[PDB]
Amino acid sequence: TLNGGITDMLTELANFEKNVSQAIHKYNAYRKAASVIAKYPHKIKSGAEAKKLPGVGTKIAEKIDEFLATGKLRKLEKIRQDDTSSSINFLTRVSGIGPSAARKFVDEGIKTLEDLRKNEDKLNHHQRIGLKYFGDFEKRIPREEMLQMQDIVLNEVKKVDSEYIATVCGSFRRGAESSGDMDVLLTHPSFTSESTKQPKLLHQVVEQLQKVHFITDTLSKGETKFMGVCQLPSKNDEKEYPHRRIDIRLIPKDQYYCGVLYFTGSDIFNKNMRAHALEKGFTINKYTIRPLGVTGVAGEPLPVDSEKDIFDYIQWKYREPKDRSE
DNA sequence: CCGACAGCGCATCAGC
DNA sequence: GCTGATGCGC
DNA sequence: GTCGG
Numbered sequence: 001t002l003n004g005g006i007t008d009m010l011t012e013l014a015n016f017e018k019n020v021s022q023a024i025h026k027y028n029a030y031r032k033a034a035s036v037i038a039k040y041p042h043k044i045k046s047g048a049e050a051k052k053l054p055g056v057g058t059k060i061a062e063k064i065d066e067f068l069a070t071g072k073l074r075k076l077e078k079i080r081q082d083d084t085s086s087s088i089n090f091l092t093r094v095s096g097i098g099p100s101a102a103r104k105f106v107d108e109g110i111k112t113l114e115d116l117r118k119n120e121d122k123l124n125h126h127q128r129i130g131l132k133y134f135g136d137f138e139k140r141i142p143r144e145e146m147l148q149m150q151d152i153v154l155n156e157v158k159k160v161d162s163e164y165i166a167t168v169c170g171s172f173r174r175g176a177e178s179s180g181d182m183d184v185l186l187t188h189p190s191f192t193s194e195s196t197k198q199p200k201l202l203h204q205v206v207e208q209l210q211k212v213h214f215i216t217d218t219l220s221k222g223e224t225k226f227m228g229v230c231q232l233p234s235k236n237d238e239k240e241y242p243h244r245r246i247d248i249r250l251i252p253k254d255q256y257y258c259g260v261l262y263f264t265g266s267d268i269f270n271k272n273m274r275a276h277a278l279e280k281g282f283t284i285n286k287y288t289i290r291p292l293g294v295t296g297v298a299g300e301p302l303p304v305d306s307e308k309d310i311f312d313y314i315q316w317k318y319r320e321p322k323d324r325s326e
Numbered sequence: 327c328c329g330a331c332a333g334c335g336c337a338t339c340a341g342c
Numbered sequence: 343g344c345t346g347a348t349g350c351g352c
Numbered sequence: 353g354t355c356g357g
């Protein structure tokens with residue numbers, strides 16, 4: 001809002017760098033500048049003012065000066081005039097179409113959704129599904145729908161085997177009023193880091209959710225990670241619910257609560273607890289928390305039976321998920 | 327001046 | 343066939 | 353593109 005013009009500009013530049021230039025570090029640099037500016041509680045008056053913020057450097061400061069002086073950016077104006085770059089950038093909005101497939105499509109004269117529809121035989125399965133649900137995938141999920149999805153997923157999982165444990169993580173678990181997708185973590189007492197005790201633990205769950213027509217499509221599935229599409233059941237001549245993105249991860253239970261911590265997030269809170277965690281000489285990844293030795297050497301992973309256990313190790317107060325914004 | 331900027335599972339392709 | 347690289351989205 | 357070593 002306050003510097004929306006600037007941050008829109010930076011976001012536009014980030015998408016260009018990612019999708020057209022294929023320069024993911026520049027993408028992230030621009031994102032990082034836009035994010036720090038978005039949190040700044042003043043109307044930016046000059047580039048030099050902005051350069052004081054971490055993540056804003058000499059070149060963005062110059063771009064901000066030009067934008068403040070003229071109401072636009074020549075670089076971006078020129079990018080908007082480039083139909084080919086605009087098409088490449090647009091196509092990467094299809095899930096499964098990255099910067100490289102987008103460029104390849106456009107070089108073959110495939111430039112719009114309509115072109116994709118008439119060239120399906122050139123899309124892989126992921127891309128076909130991304131195309132099929134192009135609009136739905138960009139829509140957000142209201143919390144009320146998430147609650148319903150949680151209730152379906154948690155109970156259907158237990159019907160396959162009462163000993164399964166599933167947890168809906170991500171922004172939902174942080175109490176967010178809307179979510180972009182559904183992140184499910186799954187475990188079972190038979191699955192531990194050392195051994196596979198049961199076959200097809202993830203496959204049977206996915207099968208069950210297909211059976212009750214909650215899961216409608218699959219982007220990818222292996223022995224530990226499922227990515228696909230789901231949809232709430234529609235009551236009588238009610239409008240259809242949008243198709244939603246769902247991810248299910250099968251985690252060994254001896255690593256389960258480290259996973260839950262990681263995939264609960266947020267983004268900026270994980271680093272805070274990590275960078276911190278080095279305090280007391282502990283290192284934290286998504287699977288484990290290990291002690292750091294006097295020489296810098298990570299020890300064996302400590303036992304974790306709950307999320308609180310992780311907190312008891314680096315000795316901080318258990319933080320409720322709602323409080324993990326940063 | 328320089329390389330880091332996360333690293334992984336899965337699908338697909340490259341190169342034998 | 344095989345193995346390793348790359349593209350992609352987390 | 354920006355940062356830190």
Ligand SMILES: O=c1ccn([C@H]2C[C@H](O)[C@@H](COP(=O)(O)NP(=O)(O)OP(=O)(O)O)O2)c(=O)[nH]1
Pocket residue numbers: 169170171172178179180181183262263264265266267270352
């Ligand atoms: O590449 C990743 C993947 C996951 N994570 C973490 C933190 C995060 O909050 C969580 C879920 O990843 P999402 O992409 O689903 N973001 P989130 O669920 O928090 O918000 P959204 O409603 O937009 O999905 O796991 C990362 O930090 N980086």
Ligand SMILES: [Cl-]
Pocket residue numbers: 022023024025026027
């Ligand atoms: Cl880059």
Ligand SMILES: [Cl-]
Pocket residue numbers: 009071072073076077
């Ligand atoms: Cl502009």
Ligand SMILES: [Cl-]
Pocket residue numbers: 285287288301
């Ligand atoms: Cl580990």
Ligand SMILES: [Mn+2]
Pocket residue numbers: 169170171179180181182183
């Ligand atoms: Mn999520």
Ligand SMILES: [Mn+2]
Pocket residue numbers: 170181182183247
């Ligand atoms: Mn997600």
Ligand SMILES: [Mn+2]
Pocket residue numbers: none
């Ligand atoms: Mn081949």
Ligand SMILES: [Mn+2]
Pocket residue numbers: 355356
């Ligand atoms: Mn510097």
Ligand code: NA
Pocket residue numbers: 050051052053054055056057
């Ligand atoms: Na700065």
Ligand code: NA
Pocket residue numbers: 091092093094095096097098
């Ligand atoms: Na895409």
